[PDB]
RNA sequence: GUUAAUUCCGAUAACGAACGAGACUCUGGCAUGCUAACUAGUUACGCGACCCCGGUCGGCGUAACUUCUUAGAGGGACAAGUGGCGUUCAGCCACCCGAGAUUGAGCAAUAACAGGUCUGUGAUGCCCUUAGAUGUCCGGGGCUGCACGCGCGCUACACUGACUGGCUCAGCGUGUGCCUACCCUACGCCGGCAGGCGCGGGUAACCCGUUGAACCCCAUUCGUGAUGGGGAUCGGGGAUUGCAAUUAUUCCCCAUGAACGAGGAAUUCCCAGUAAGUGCGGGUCAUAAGCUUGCGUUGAUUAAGUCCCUGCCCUUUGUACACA
């Protein structure tokens, strides 16, 4: 009945995205597909960490579409890692009781904070007289 | 050239400036290449504020 | 205009208009005292105000 | 009916004060308006060294103009448009005025 | 290293010495209250000045100062 | 011989000739008491323990 | 919830840092416990949260070295994980342990400096550090044209240096750098 | 200096060693049986996948560059 | 209840390919055998039956992406093309093995020269990817 | 099957060149000057052969097959693309040349332009490099 | 003493100051608060397709909205709070809360150099040529020439690898030109390929384009062999550009398959989204990146010190130099 729709972004360096949660059971799918088969596979649990963390009874009441867009592949998936869980704490913090939002924010930031808090780092600019940011070109005396 | 660069420093510090400067450079007082140059008042060389304070020709 | 130049050159190509012809009045009226202009580009108009010393001459 | 209106400027405060000039027009004389829709900026960037001969450290510069695109859609006949576009226009803001 | 210049305390000593009684130990409230007194141009040259001033405003309230 | 741990209590500053050893006062963590000045390679924080081989012989002091 | 495991198989719990200088700086148990050596960083923006990185993690990156190698950090996780498989095999006991014991084997105690030489003793995280480079430099170069795979040469390293058996690259240049500090003091 | 002239193909000894030892070792990696047996790596992952599928091994993990395979359990 | 994309893609392209051979009305070309599938390649492929893999993966593509043109499933496929001494780039695939195999994926009604331009995929192409994702799903579990 | 089988020929001599036999068949055959990998696979394709085989493995009837489609590419399907002296300046015909013919080929055609005193022949005869290369740095290793 | 700093504090015959530094401008980050959007989108709703109520769709249309996109105004962090170290000064270190607890560049100055440019100029003195021209045009050649030495770089020496399929992700940009003759390309046919022939879009958040980029990830083949590493050299053919490719413009196909087994003396650059690997735009461009200038992606080891080496700076000292 009533709209309980979530937008939430998670940003990695330049990768976003946007999580979209609602009322319904425990499915989990980013772009159309689901969470055991998102290559690169080998950062698997590295997707499954906040659901290791919280348990599925916390993605119980909840089903999460996010959208990906930018950067690349494990910018990508730590861009999801992140929303993911911001996504369940403002679903948390607007349509229940905040204290589960409390717990899941300690136990969630007591295992790794880049979970909520965005990593500000993005790639710095080449200056001239260098083939990179600071690397200059070899110096030839004599 | 001294008496030209008195008179316009002298004619753009009455008409109101907070500094002047100009720099002659040639080979004015001999065959070699020197430079004079005339400065009174407060002056700005770095930042943008040269942009919107200073004019230059 | 069925011309349909880019914005991008267009914006380019009234630079290269104004530096042309400040650099032509430049050479025309350095006995007059001048200083800069400033071209009020309207549509179907075009006013482009001379900024000088000596407008009589 | 549907005028839409394209104002081009290299500055920026000039521009804001154009379209917020003619949206103050448009309140004025009480018609639906869509907002100022802001175009992604141009940077056209030019590099070139600063060096007219060819020694030194090799240096370069960044020259860059900013193009900055900001339109608006009307919904009026002719002759208003006409009237709005014809005063209060910032001689540094280039107009083209869109019919369909 | 994050030092302030002397445009900073210059203005910090003067902004203390002449409105003391309108200043404490809050970096935002005196921020606001030398907004309020000063024309700073800018806000970067405002938090230098605000913050050299909480810190004199501790000095003077704990001890006195040259 | 033994080898024996000593607690860091105090960093006395830099030393050497391109200023990569850190010479350091440790006590020796079963007799408190007992505390002597040591050259230390590499980054040291107040508070850890050194693995001395040799309780003996002693750094210079600067 | 509880449990944290590494990758899917080993607990971070039953571990055994024998060496207590090397408490804190060696990051394992109860709170460095993470489920992949993969994270997003930020362990190097000042200088002592170097320590508090997990160990595994440091392995995965002093892997990735020499020129066509350098970035490849997906790849290293996955080295490192089969490197655990080897030896979960081989000794049967928990693979991070016999990690601990491979590092606080490995790394040298005392070396020399300038201050002809003079012996200076080592700082425990410098200790780690060169251990960790050490054993990787080892494997690296028992791996380098060779039929056996890095991913157990890795794994064989692990073993020699954690039994001390000297047939260790990292072990053997311990020794060595203790042998020339013993007597240039 | 020294070089290494793998078998391409089985001796039937070295089938018949392969048959007896392999299977009883702690790990087995085509590695470790190409370096033990003086046999190519292809060879090598031909036979332990031939010996997998006589279903005497277990298989542990398996990639594109290495798979693991270890010996039967003994209870 | 199953689509593909609730699958794993790198056993279902292997499981449409052998549909594909056990259907064997798709007409395969005649220079299969002797072509190299790029400029940035260095030899043929491996694998014989390669088209039809190449058919299925292109039957993939444009479900989950419809109007690709011949140009567009040459940036799919395309890869670095070693220079040798000079540094590698990026290069195309071959454009004939993309246009046989859009022309022979609608020769059998799989896809359609749609309106807009590009290859659409019709529901029966459609019917016969997602019921072979089914037939994935239940030989995985 | 893995076992090695009787008749596994360790050395084939074909086109009087050796072949290492315990190396795959596709890069064994390379071993022949005038096919490559390429032309190798091709063969080896045209021929209806498993390639996972080994060149002891396979029999003399078929590797007899395979040197005649070597020796004959286009009366077994291989195009005229694919040949290494297509459209030949003395008889105009397309062919695969192989190890006898290929350096001698090779020299027809050197001799034929130091015969005409063309510039590519004058630098094929003083040892330059004959594809307009700077040569001021580079090629010093032969040249003394 | 302290700082990135003649940056401050503090001694003090100095006290008040200006330029430099810093402040400033552009940029990166953070806002579920503001402004707005059919040239950006989301969420719902209704059809349409497919699979067994539900799931998927960059398949299609519209009701709200601006989280994602775009960019304006604001705000936001100052060593502010705590605890040490320090005249308790300037400041430094650690930690909480936090988008950040040093983002990166631009501008940069009393002065000098006989550093470079007269080949950027209708900037230019003087000299020289000025009709058999050193002016100007046209044709050909050279600027590439190869016993040698040096500098900037690219490819590599492989198994962390190569090969072949499979899967899956960007950000800078640019694009039809006054003269001026040359634009980016979708989509459809032919051909292995380079390419060729057709109608279309685009002066551009509108079309290429959701820029399906590489590395990476998944699965084969290989098996320590100068081997499927490496791709120089060289032969034969096929296309494009241009008026014209020969001294091979470039691209493609087949074949040939060289040194190179990690590099002595010496030596370059760099500390966080940095180095390095990786590809992509721009400039040059009829053809065109082994270069340069930008952009993203994968993303570390070590260090938070010192004057030992090399630089320069300050103080003191010496001078018969002061065109130094
Ligand atoms: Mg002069
Ligand atoms: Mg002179
Ligand atoms: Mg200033
Ligand atoms: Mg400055
Ligand atoms: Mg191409
Ligand atoms: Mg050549
Ligand atoms: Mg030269
Ligand atoms: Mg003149
Ligand atoms: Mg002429
Ligand atoms: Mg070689
Ligand atoms: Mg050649
Ligand atoms: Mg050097
Ligand atoms: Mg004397």
């Not at chain 3, 914006?11 to 202009?37: C, H, M, P």
């Not at chain 8, 009883?24 to 010996?51: D, M």
């Not at chain 10, 034929?112 to 290793?141: C, D, S």
């Amino acid at each position: 009945g009533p709209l309980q729709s979530v937008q939430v972004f998670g940003r990695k360096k330049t990768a976003t995205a946007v999580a979209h949660c609602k009322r319904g059971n425990g499915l989990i799918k980013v772009n159309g597909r689901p969470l055991e088969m998102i290559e690169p596979r080998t950062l698997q649990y590295k997707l499954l960490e906040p659901v290791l963390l919280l348990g599925k009874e916390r993605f119980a009441g909840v089903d999460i579409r996010v959208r990906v867009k930018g950067g690349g592949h494990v910018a990508q998936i730590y861009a999801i890692r992140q929303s993911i869980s911001k996504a369940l704490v403002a679903y948390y913090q607007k349509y229940v009781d905040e204290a589960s939002k409390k717990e899941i924010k300690d136990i969630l930031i007591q295992y790794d904070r880049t979970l909520l808090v965005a990593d500000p780092r993005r790639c710095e600019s080449k200056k001239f007289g260098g083939p990179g940011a600071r690397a200059r070109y070899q110096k030839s005396y004599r | 050239v001294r008496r030209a660069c008195y008179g316009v420093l002298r004619f753009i510090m009455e008409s109101g400036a907070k500094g002047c400067e100009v720099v002659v450079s040639g080979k004015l007082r001999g065959q070699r290449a020197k430079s004079m140059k005339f400065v009174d008042g407060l002056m700005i060389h770095s930042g943008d504020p040269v942009n919107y304070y200073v004019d230059t020709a | 205009m069925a011309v349909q130049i880019s914005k991008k050159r267009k914006f380019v190509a009234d630079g290269i208009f104004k530096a042309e012809l400040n650099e032509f009045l430049t050479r025309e009226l350095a006995e007059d005292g001048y200083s800069g202009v400033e071209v009020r580009v309207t549509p179907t108009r075009t006013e482009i105000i001379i900024l000088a010393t000596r407008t009589q001459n | 009916h549907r005028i839409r209106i394209t104002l081009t400027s290299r500055n920026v405060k000039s521009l804001e004060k154009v379209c917020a000039d003619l949206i103050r027009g448009a309140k004025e004389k009480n018609l639906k308006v869509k907002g100022p829709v802001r175009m992604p900026t141009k940077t056209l960037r030019i590099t070139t060294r600063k060096t007219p001969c060819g020694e030194g450290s090799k240096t370069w510069d960044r020259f860059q103009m900013r193009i900055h695109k900001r339109l608006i859609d009307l919904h009026s006949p002719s002759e208003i448009v006409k009237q709005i576009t014809s005063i209060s226009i910032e001689p540094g803001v280039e107009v083209e005025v869109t019919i369909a | 290293g994050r030092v302030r210049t002397k445009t900073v305390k210059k203005a910090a000593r003067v902004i203390i010495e002449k409105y003391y009684t309108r200043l404490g130990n809050d970096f935002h409230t005196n921020k606001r209250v030398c907004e309020e007194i000063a024309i700073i141009p800018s806000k970067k040259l405002r938090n230098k000045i605000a913050g050299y001033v909480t810190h004199l405003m501790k000095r003077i309230q704990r001890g006195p100062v040259r | 011989q033994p080898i024996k741990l000593a607690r860091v209590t105090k960093v006395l500053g830099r030393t050497g000739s391109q200023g990569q050893c850190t010479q350091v006062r440790v006590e020796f963590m079963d007799d408190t008491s007992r505390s002597i000045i040591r050259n230390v390679k590499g980054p040291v924080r107040e508070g850890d323990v050194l693995t001395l081989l040799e309780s003996e012989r002693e750094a210079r002091r600067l | 919830t509880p449990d944290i495991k590494l990758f899917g198989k080993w607990s971070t719990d039953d571990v055994q840092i024998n060496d207590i200088s090397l408490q804190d700086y060696i990051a394992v148990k109860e709170k460095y416990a993470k489920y992949l050596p993969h994270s997003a960083g930020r362990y190097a923006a000042k200088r002592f949260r170097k320590a508090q990185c997990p160990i595994v993690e440091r392995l995965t990156n002093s892997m990735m070295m020499h020129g066509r190698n350098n970035g490849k950090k997906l790849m290293t996780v996955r080295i490192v994980k089969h490197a655990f498989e080897i030896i979960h095999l081989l000794t049967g006991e928990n693979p991070l342990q016999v990690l601990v014991n491979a590092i606080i084997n490995s790394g040298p105690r005392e070396d020399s400096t300038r201050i002809r030489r003079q012996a200076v003793d080592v700082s425990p995280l410098r200790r780690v550090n060169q251990a960790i480079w050490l054993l990787c430099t080892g494997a690296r170069e028992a791996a380098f044209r060779n039929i056996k795979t890095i991913a157990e040469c890795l794994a064989d390293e692990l073993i020699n240096a954690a039994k001390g058996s000297s047939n260790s690259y990292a072990i053997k240049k311990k020794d060595e750098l203790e042998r020339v500090a013993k007597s240039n003091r | 200096r020294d070089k290494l002239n793998n078998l391409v193909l089985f001796d039937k000894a070295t089938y018949d060693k392969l048959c007896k030892e392999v299977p009883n070792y702690k790990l087995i990696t085509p590695a470790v049986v190409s370096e033990r047996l003086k046999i190519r790596g292809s060879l090598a992952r031909a036979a332990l996948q031939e010996l997998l599928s006589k279903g005497l091994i277990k298989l542990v993990s398996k990639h594109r560059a290495q798979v693991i395979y270890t010996r039967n359990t003994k209870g | 209840g199953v689509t593909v994309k609730d699958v794993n893609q790198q056993e279902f392209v292997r499981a449409l390919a052998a549909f594909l051979k056990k259907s064997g009305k798709l007409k395969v070309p005649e220079w299969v055998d002797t072509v190299k599938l790029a400029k940035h390649k260095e030899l043929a492929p491996y694998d014989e039956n390669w088209f039809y893999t190449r058919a299925a993966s292109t039957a993939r593509h444009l479900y989950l992406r419809g109007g690709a043109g011949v140009g567009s499933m040459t940036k799919i496929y395309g890869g670095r093309q070693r220079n040798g001494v000079m540094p590698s780039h990026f290069s195309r695939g071959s454009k004939s093995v993309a246009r046989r195999v859009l022309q022979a994926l609608e020769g059998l009604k799989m896809v359609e020269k749609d309106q807009d331009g590009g290859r659409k995929l019709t529901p029966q192409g459609q019917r016969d990817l997602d019921r072979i994702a089914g037939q994935v799903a239940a030989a995985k579990k | 099957s893995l076992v090695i089988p009787e008749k596994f020929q360790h050395i084939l001599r074909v086109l009087n060149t050796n072949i290492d036999g315990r190396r795959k068949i596709a890069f064994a055959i390379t071993a022949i000057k005038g096919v490559g990998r390429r032309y190798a696979h091709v063969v080896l394709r045209k021929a209806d052969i498993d390639l996972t085989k080994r060149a002891g493995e396979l029999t003399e009837d078929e590797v007899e097959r395979v040197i005649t489609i070597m020796q004959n590419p286009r009366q077994y399907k291989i195009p005229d693309w694919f040949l290494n002296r297509q459209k030949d300046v003395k008889d105009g015909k397309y062919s695969q040349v192989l190890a006898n013919g290929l350096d001698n080929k090779l020299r027809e055609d050197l001799e034929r332009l130091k015969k005409i005193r063309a510039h590519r022949g004058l630098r094929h005869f003083w040892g330059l490099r004959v594809r307009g290369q700077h040569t001021k740095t580079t090629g010093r290793r032969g040249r003394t």
